[PDB]
Design a protein around this ligand. Structure first.
Ligand SMILES: O=C(O)C[C@H](NC(=O)c1ncnc2[nH]cnc12)c1ccccc1
Length: 167
């Protein structure tokens, strides 16, 4: 038993809610919150800007040190950093950004990072301003992630569309 509330059940391991991931994290304090990061860990907008703002820019400061030491991530890759005031850890996962012309096939590789963690609070990778088809991304999530994932969808109309079309 865990502490998430009001989530709709989709498969053996995936739950979904129309919610602000920042507020879900502040409430649950999950072991792992997933950030929809880019390879430079420049947290400007979307999930990343929202999470970083909620940490008072501490996420960005930590991320800049990470990049200075290690260089950029790969599209499809991830790193584990602090969750600051939101979670124990933040798993920064880079899905492909269709608005940058990146390869949508890399979405499955991106979701595979979730399997290294027993339970996660996460956004829908590559959706929103990342420009991929969100129905396709939810499908890839359910068909790739085997650990317990609690998906937070910000946009109400999107959430309703995703639930109503889920197979
Ligand atoms: O779920 C959605 O609608 C799409 C989702 N975007 C957000 O979650 C989001 N965006 C902006 N500001 C926010 N403040 C709280 N959540 C926020 C997203 C998924 C993947 C990559 C980029 C964005």
């Amino acid at each position: 038993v865990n502490s998430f509330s009001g989530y709709l059940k989709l498969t053996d391991n995936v739950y979904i809610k129309n919610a602000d991931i920042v507020e879900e994290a502040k409430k649950v304090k999950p072991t792992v919150v997933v950030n929809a990061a880019n390879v430079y860990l420049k947290h400007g907008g979307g999930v990343a800007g929202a999470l970083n703002k909620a940490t008072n820019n501490a996420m960005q400061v930590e991320s800049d040190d990470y990049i200075a030491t290690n260089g950029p991530l790969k599209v499809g890759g991830s790193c584990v950093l602090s969750g600051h005031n939101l979670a124990k850890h933040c798993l920064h996962v880079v899905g492909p950004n269709v608005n940058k012309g990146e390869d949508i096939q890399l979405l499955k590789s991106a979701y595979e990072n979730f399997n290294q963690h027993e339970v996660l609070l996460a956004p829908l990778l590559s959706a929103g301003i990342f420009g991929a088809d969100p129905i396709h991304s939810l499908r890839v999530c359910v068909d790739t992630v085997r650990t317990n994932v609690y998906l937070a969808v910000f946009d109400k109309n999107l959430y309703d569309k995703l639930v109503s079309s889920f197979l």
